[PDB]
Amino acid sequence: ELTVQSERAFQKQPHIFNNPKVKTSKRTKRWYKNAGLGFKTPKTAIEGSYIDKKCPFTGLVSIRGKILTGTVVSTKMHRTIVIRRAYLHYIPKYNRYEKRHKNVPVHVSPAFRVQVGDIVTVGQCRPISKTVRFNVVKVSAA
Amino acid sequence: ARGPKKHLKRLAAPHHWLLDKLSGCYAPRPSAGPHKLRESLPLIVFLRNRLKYALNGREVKAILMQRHVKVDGKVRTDTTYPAGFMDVITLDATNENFRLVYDVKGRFAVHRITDEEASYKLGKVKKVQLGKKGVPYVVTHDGRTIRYPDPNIKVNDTVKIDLASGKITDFIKFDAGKLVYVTGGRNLGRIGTIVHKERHDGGFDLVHIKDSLDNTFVTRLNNVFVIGEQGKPYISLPKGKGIKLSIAEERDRRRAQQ
Amino acid sequence: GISRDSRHKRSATGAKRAQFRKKRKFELGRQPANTKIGAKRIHSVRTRGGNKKYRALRIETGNFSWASEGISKKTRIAGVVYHPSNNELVRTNTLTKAAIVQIDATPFRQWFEAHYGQTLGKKSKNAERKWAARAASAKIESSVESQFSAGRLYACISSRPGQSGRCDGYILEGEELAFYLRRLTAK
Amino acid sequence: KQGFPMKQGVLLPTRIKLLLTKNVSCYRPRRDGERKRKSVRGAIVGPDLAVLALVIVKKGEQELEGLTDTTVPKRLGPKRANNIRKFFGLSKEDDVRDFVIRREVTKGEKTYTKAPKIQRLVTPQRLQRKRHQRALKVRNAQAQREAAAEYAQLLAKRLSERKAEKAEIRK
RNA sequence: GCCCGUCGCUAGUACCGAUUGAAUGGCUUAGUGAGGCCUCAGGAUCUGCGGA
RNA sequence: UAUCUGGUUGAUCCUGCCAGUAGUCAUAUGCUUGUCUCAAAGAUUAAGCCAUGCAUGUCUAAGUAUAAGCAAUUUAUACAGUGAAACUGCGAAUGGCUCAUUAAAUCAGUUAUCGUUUAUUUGAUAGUUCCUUUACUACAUGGUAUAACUGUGGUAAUUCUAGAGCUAAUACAUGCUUAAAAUUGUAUUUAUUAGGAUGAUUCAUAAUAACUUUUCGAAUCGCAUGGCCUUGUGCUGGCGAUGGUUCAUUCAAAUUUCUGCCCUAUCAACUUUCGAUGGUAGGAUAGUGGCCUACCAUGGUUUCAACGGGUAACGGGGAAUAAGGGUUCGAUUCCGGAGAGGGAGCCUGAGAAACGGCUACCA
RNA sequence: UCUUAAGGUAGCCAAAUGCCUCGUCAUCUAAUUAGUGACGCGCAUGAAUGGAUUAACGAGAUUCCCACUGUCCCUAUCUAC
RNA sequence: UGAACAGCCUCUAGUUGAUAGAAUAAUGUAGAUAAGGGAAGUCGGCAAAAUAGAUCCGUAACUUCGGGAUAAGGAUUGGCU
């Protein structure tokens, strides 16, 4: 999207009150956190204008469980991407490996600018959508 | 399965109960209590098969009902009360007094104690919170809850609880040197001292435990139970003092004490 | 009963899942409350675990909070004017969460007059000293300034009448009030 | 005929089946929650009836044999204390243990009076239980207050120790 | 010496085959749609302006 | 216990299969049949149909007993012991059986609940129940039923019951004895504020303004009957059982991360009308979630085998046979699923889509 | 073996061409000289005196099926002239 | 109105001409309707009935690949805001 307040509703962090009766500085009160496990919260998640209630840093979604790494293969959806987690399955009888791949839809916060082919690390969270269960926490590309 | 399960079969019973596999279809399913269904010793198996006092379940029930038997400081009458790790079971009519504890093989021992020690028990504080009205409280591994603990008492410590009244007699912290009781895992019943922990994020924490004979092993922090100072236990340990010698060493000891 | 299981939805790969188990109570859904206005009528629905839920219909009044002041008063509901999900709820005057509604202004107006001693639109010594201490508090923004003259306050409903039985809400203010007013006047 | 009772409320001269729930006539449930579809008859009186049960709201000028001429006395008198008080016109303070109905029963030659046990009857047992409840609550109140004060003093001592440690630090 | 195929008899197996062939099961468009449930009402009757 | 042998030829050397050999908690069957221990056993075809009779009922000292029952008030005039019948509370959602349906479904290992419900057990836990703010309260304590019963009956018939008169509660609908310590409980909901622990949180908890058709905060029961005198049926007083809100515990439940399944291209494109992938918002849920709904973008899977089809396919722990590799089987004693002829709906309950529970259709 | 100039080949058929004939078998129906599919020693089928098949088309001929109805069971009534 | 120099009604224009009056018998000619059944009628579904416009969905064998096709089979249809 382009404008912050796009949908038919007003986008704001729940239980965050601007207190419009105070003329303080910085003209905003954004609620963030640190996801833990050493995952650094980006400065875009620090200072940005979006809301994305599903963001692990600003939204009310907590990262816990399996931490995974993949390479994205699709970014056409809205604030959601699909990663191809390649792995080598092992057949015991023939005592050698075979190539296999899995696609796990992973939710992406606007704090990152992801591109097809990058390598992104994600973490398990509560079911975001029917198939989406993870959120991206770091990207890597060059 | 459209509700709670109220039956247990002999094969599905935990192995350390040491029930035989051919006498009866079912096993005594523990009722709800301070401890889990596993890693807990029912009074029926502590009497009928451990102490051999009663020959049948009906006689175990009669013993329980005439109120000779009291776990911790309170009399128990249910046939299959889940007496857990450090629970003290009295049997005041025969003047004995046991504290449950794991032998080095990994089973509930029949270790007997005196009343001067039965007047207390230890518990690994498993959670610390602030309850209602801002009051802090601790909850131990046997579901027992104590309000208003010392602020220095944190999770993974041990709290000494008087059976007369739930109150913190003292506590043992979790740090290098403390003697610990490995309650869980492949080292069920082993006793040693802590040299250092690992403290992984998210994953299960790890501790490196060495014993009197310097046999270093590793165990998850969820399966340890610190019980006293360095070589200074706060409880009396069963025979063997939590040292597991090899199979050949056990055979040699058996043949030498034949 | 309405089933909440995903065993009936098509798989992510378009695979038609097969009927595995008959429907179950621990995944049952219930019909929407569709709470209207006037002549409070709350039906109690038992929920799993022996809990109680207040399926509200025809609610009369609700507790609405002025977040800048911190106070909250019971107030009669004039009616919905904008709903982000569906305009049908606006048309039929349905009370659900995040509904932008008009409510009465007299309780909040009287509270403002008795707490700060000012007026919108248009006596004891302790009262005068209190108003002097609370001076420059009539700096309330032009939106609500004209709102109280209009006699109705725009508030967002923050409760779930189909769940809690109450239609509690909070007064629109500042940026969000301006956004919702712009949506109303977008023509 | 066929023994289907007339249901109070349904307005039709026929026999129709309803889902009879709890607290309704013509159906005695056997299980908690069960509702069985029985067959009843309408409140409309019709030629299809076999017996019609009537109650004499006002007696006529001539009596009947197994009727107003003859009365059958109430089998059991009041059993609760206040029911006995109201039925005998007792006041707030009269004893009720002596007015109780002493029904005479004779096993052959041995006769004895069986009186109902009085429930809701104030008794030293009940008063003792009430006093015990009061004592339990007040004891609990004292215990909680003293424990709260003790932990407050312990926390104050701990914070004083923390201040002493802060003073000791920084040389 | 061996051996091939047509034809003739017997037996078995499968195939094509008019019959808009026939059954059994699964899914499903469309039409009809019981039933319990939620809900708008209806309020017999019973009870102290009310309640069920 | 890392082994072979007979068979194409006049004879030979090979490929090659047929056959022989041995095992099978692998079945049937034929013949024959003394003893001991042990023991499978209507799965295969028909999850086909079922006569009949059983398999879920249950009480103590401790919910209600004036049975017009038994035995006694040798303890008692309200009762006192036992006790049918019945109301009440629990359980009947466990167990047992079968393997039909199921091919990322179940299931196994491994994860999460910072994503929720949880009867019961265990351990803690309601001076604010005068708050509608000191009699709403009768508080030496409150109200009405109604069961059980007698009598009148209907039906060929059912674990059918109507009309009448009785009567209790730990059944229902109410309701105080809480002083008053500070600064007004708890429960619900909304908005605002601070914030010992975790890797991490809007967490735990606390403070405000209120809302609530209002939850809970003991009118229950059995024993022991003791201490204080200003001796009154006064004041205090033990052992318990039952009940109760919140939190924790336990028994669990529901979802959930990764990985893994037989044969099929004579199944290559599939999902996307009207849910498909995702976003916003709301309902719904016990709770997350396209679980459902409205608006919006056009997405999601696939030759690393999708979608479709078959399975004589419940999955696993495991079984038989094997130098090493492996092959075949696993209906079935244990774990987890699913079913009660098919299918759906639902009451009660903490727990059911429950079938030895109902509702309807089909057979 | 007689004989012709050659002796009906490919094909097709009780066909609009088959006397016997309502041929024989199957299907369609309760019942079928009808329809269709087969069998062909075909009185007397058959190759631009064109053979066979053929999508579409047909105010052509024929059979069956669904719907539909006074065609009929079994008739009755109404209006105009 | 409607797709429409279709059908129906009206404007300018033109006619109101066709022997007429009274009754409402049979049989007629033309138009119709019929309960239940639904071709059993008859040589034969002859006559009649049924469907029908538009939008959306769905559409087989066969094929000369162009068609078959409006295949078959279903749903909606007004007014007003």
From Swiss-Prot, chain A:
GO CC, alphabetical: 90S preribosome; cytosol; cytosolic small ribosomal subunit
UniProt GO MF annotations: rRNA binding; structural constituent of ribosome
SUPFAM superfamilies: Nucleic acid-binding proteins
Subcellular location: Cytoplasm
The keyword Cell cycle belongs to this UniProt entry's keyword annotation: no
Keyword Ligase: no
Family as reported in the entry's similarity comment: Belongs to the universal ribosomal protein uS17 family.
Quaternary context: Component of the small ribosomal subunit (SSU). Mature yeast ribosomes consist of a small (40S) and a large (60S) subunit. The 40S small subunit contains 1 molecule of ribosomal RNA (18S rRNA) and 33 different proteins (encoded by 57 genes). The large 60S subunit contains 3 rRNA molecules (25S, 5.8S and 5S rRNA) and 46 different proteins (encoded by 81 genes).
Protein name from the UniProt record: Small ribosomal subunit protein uS17A
Species the sequence originates in: Saccharomyces cerevisiae (strain ATCC 204508 / S288c) (Baker's yeast)
Curated annotation (Swiss-Prot), chain B:
Sites bearing Phosphothreonine, chain numbering: T114
GO BP field: cytoplasmic translation; translation
GO terms under cellular component: 90S preribosome; cytoplasm; cytosol; cytosolic small ribosomal subunit
InterPro entries, sorted: KOW, Rib_uL2_dom2, Ribosomal_eS4, Ribosomal_eS4_C, Ribosomal_eS4_central_region, Ribosomal_eS4_central_sf, Ribosomal_eS4_KOW, Ribosomal_eS4_N
Keyword set, alphabetical order: Cytoplasm, Isopeptide bond, Phosphoprotein, Ribonucleoprotein, Ribosomal protein, RNA-binding, rRNA-binding, Ubl conjugation
Phosphoserine sites (modified residues): S31, S246
Residue ranges occupied by any S4 RNA-binding domain in the UniProt entry: 41-104
Gene Ontology MF annotations: RNA binding; rRNA binding; structural constituent of ribosome
Compartments reported by the entry: Cytoplasm
Database matches in PANTHER family: 30S/40S RIBOSOMAL PROTEIN S4, SMALL RIBOSOMAL SUBUNIT PROTEIN ES4
Cited function: Component of the ribosome, a large ribonucleoprotein complex responsible for the synthesis of proteins in the cell. The small ribosomal subunit (SSU) binds messenger RNAs (mRNAs) and translates the encoded message by selecting cognate aminoacyl-transfer RNA (tRNA) molecules. The large subunit (LSU) contains the ribosomal catalytic site termed the peptidyl transferase center (PTC), which catalyzes the formation of peptide bonds, thereby polymerizing the amino acids delivered by tRNAs into a polypeptide chain.
Miscellaneous section: Present with 573 molecules/cell in log phase SD medium.
Subunit structure and binding partners: Component of the small ribosomal subunit (SSU). Mature yeast ribosomes consist of a small (40S) and a large (60S) subunit. The 40S small subunit contains 1 molecule of ribosomal RNA (18S rRNA) and 33 different proteins (encoded by 57 genes). The large 60S subunit contains 3 rRNA molecules (25S, 5.8S and 5S rRNA) and 46 different proteins (encoded by 81 genes).
The name this protein goes by in its record: Small ribosomal subunit protein eS4A
Lineage: Eukaryota, Fungi, Dikarya, Ascomycota, Saccharomycotina
Gene this chain is encoded by: RPS4A
From Swiss-Prot, chain D:
Protein family per UniProt: Belongs to the eukaryotic ribosomal protein eS6 family.
GO molecular function: structural constituent of ribosome
Keywords: Cytoplasm, Isopeptide bond, Nucleus, Phosphoprotein, Ribonucleoprotein, Ribosomal protein, Ribosome biogenesis, rRNA processing, Ubl conjugation
Modified residues annotated as Phosphothreonine in this record: T106
Subcellular location: Cytoplasm; Nucleus, Nucleolus
Naturally occurring in which organism (per UniProt): Saccharomyces cerevisiae (strain ATCC 204508 / S288c)
Transmembrane segments: none
Name the record gives this protein: Small ribosomal subunit protein eS6A
Gene Ontology cellular-component terms listed: 90S preribosome; cytosol; cytosolic small ribosomal subunit; nucleolus; nucleoplasm; small-subunit processome
GO biological process: maturation of SSU-rRNA from tricistronic rRNA transcript (SSU-rRNA, 5.8S rRNA, LSU-rRNA); translation
Role noted for this protein: Component of the ribosome, a large ribonucleoprotein complex responsible for the synthesis of proteins in the cell. The small ribosomal subunit (SSU) binds messenger RNAs (mRNAs) and translates the encoded message by selecting cognate aminoacyl-transfer RNA (tRNA) molecules. The large subunit (LSU) contains the ribosomal catalytic site termed the peptidyl transferase center (PTC), which catalyzes the formation of peptide bonds, thereby polymerizing the amino acids delivered by tRNAs into a polypeptide chain.
Assembly description: Component of the small ribosomal subunit (SSU). Mature yeast ribosomes consist of a small (40S) and a large (60S) subunit. The 40S small subunit contains 1 molecule of ribosomal RNA (18S rRNA) and 33 different proteins (encoded by 57 genes). The large 60S subunit contains 3 rRNA molecules (25S, 5.8S and 5S rRNA) and 46 different proteins (encoded by 81 genes). Interacts with snoRNA U3. uS11 interacts with MPP10. Component of the ribosomal small subunit (SSU) processome composed of at least 40 protein subunits and snoRNA U3.
Cross-link (Glycyl lysine isopeptide (Lys-Gly) (interchain with G-Cter in ubiquitin)): K59, K74, K92, K157
